From Swiss-Prot:
Record key words, sorted: Apoptosis, Endoplasmic reticulum, Heme, Host-virus interaction, Iron, Membrane, Metal-binding, Oxidoreductase, Phosphoprotein, Transmembrane, Transmembrane helix
Tissues expressed in: Expressed at higher levels in renal cancer tissue than in normal tissue (at protein level).
GO biological process, any: response to oxidative stress
Bilayer topology term: Single-pass type IV membrane protein
UniProt-annotated location(s): Endoplasmic reticulum membrane
Species of origin: Homo sapiens (Human)
Disease note: Heme oxygenase 1 deficiency: A disease characterized by impaired stress hematopoiesis, resulting in marked erythrocyte fragmentation and intravascular hemolysis, coagulation abnormalities, endothelial damage, and iron deposition in renal and hepatic tissues. Clinical features include persistent hemolytic anemia, asplenia, nephritis, generalized erythematous rash, growth retardation and hepatomegaly.
Name of the encoding gene: HMOX1
Designated name of the protein: Heme oxygenase 1
Primary site of residence: endoplasmic reticulum
Positions bound to heme b: K9, H16, Y125, E174
Subunit-structure text: (Microbial infection) Interacts with SARS-CoV-2 ORF3A protein; the interaction promotes ORF3A-induced autophagy but is unlikely to be involved in ORF3A-mediated induction of reticulophagy. Homodimer and higher order homooligomer. Oligomerization is crucial for its stability and function in the endoplasmic reticulum. Interacts with FLVCR2; this interaction is potentiated in the presence of heme.
Residues of the full protein shown: 10 to 223 of 288
Top-level taxon: Eukaryota
GO MF term list: enzyme binding; heme binding; heme oxygenase (decyclizing) activity; identical protein binding; metal ion binding; protein homodimerization activity; structural molecule activity
Intervals, Cytoplasmic compartment: 1-214
Length: 214
């Protein structure tokens, strides 16, 4: 449709259905996942979110992004720091992995935040709305599999405490995305950047898959 929110959904249906077939994501999705694979996923998210939130901060007051700036409701860095401290220990920052696929993703986020700010919404959409939608099933799959102890940590990332209702926040976020002012060309590039975002994720999984199995 003409609403950016609906245009994004429709345009990424293909790459999303594709992602549901990426081995690593297939296995996780079907209950196949280990502590080592999970840790890798979490490390990935950490690096991705640090770069994403760094660029959102740089462009928070710009009209190309301000409407979708929800620091309190969406920030994920702090939750990932908590989780990684549990998964990798007190010196997690010194030992977490930083792979080519992770760097590739981070590189585009910075390129976008510094030279093509008008496209940052596409990356925020792909990450936030997605993680917000995959949250429940994933944390549940994690619990029922990882056989965690009873320390109450490691899964903070899957809970957005500052969002009372995910479905209601989704409406609000879509509405803010649709309030953004953009020319037909920018709008087109935003859609294409979203596809690029999915691809970065899909190829990140293909790497985590290659890495896990040796
Ligand atoms: C591994 C398999 C995956 C499954 C089973 C899955 C499942 C879902 C589900 C059930 C929704 C439906 C939301 C609705 O009710 O409309 C959704 C939304 C979404 N997913 Fe995934 N997903 C997967 C992978 C991905 C990946 C790799 C990304 C990108 C990191 C992603 C990004 C999104 C986004 C952006 C939405 C928002 C849709 C909207 O515009 O409303 N998903 N996903």
């Amino acid at each position: 449709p003409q609403d950016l929110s609906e245009a994004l959904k429709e345009a990424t249906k293909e790459v999303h259905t594709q992602a549901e077939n990426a081995e690593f994501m297939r296995n996780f999705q079907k209950g196949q996942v280990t502590r080592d694979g999970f840790k890798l996923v979490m490390a990935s998210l950490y690096h991705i979110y640090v770069a994403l939130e760094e660029e959102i901060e740089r462009n928070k007051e710009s009209p190309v992004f301000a409407p979708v700036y929800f620091p309190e409701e969406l920030h994920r860095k702090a939750a990932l720091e908590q989780d990684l401290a549990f998964w990798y220990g007190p010196r997690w920052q010194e030992v977490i992995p930083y792979t080519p696929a992770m760097q590739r993703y981070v590189k585009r986020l910075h390129e976008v935040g510094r030279t093509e700010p008008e496209l940052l919404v596409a990356h925020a959409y792909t990450r936030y709305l997605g993680d917000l939608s995959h949250g429940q099933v994933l944390k549940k799959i994690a619990q029922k599999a990882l056989d965690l102890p009873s320390s109450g940590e490691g899964l903070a990332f899957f809970t957005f405490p500052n969002i009372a209702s995910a479905t209601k926040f989704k409406q609000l976020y879509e509405s803010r995305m649709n309030s953004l002012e953009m020319t037909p060309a920018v709008r087109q590039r935003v859609i294409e950047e979203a596809k690029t975002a999915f691809l970065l994720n899909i190829q990140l999984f293909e790497e985590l898959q290659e890495l896990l199995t040796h």
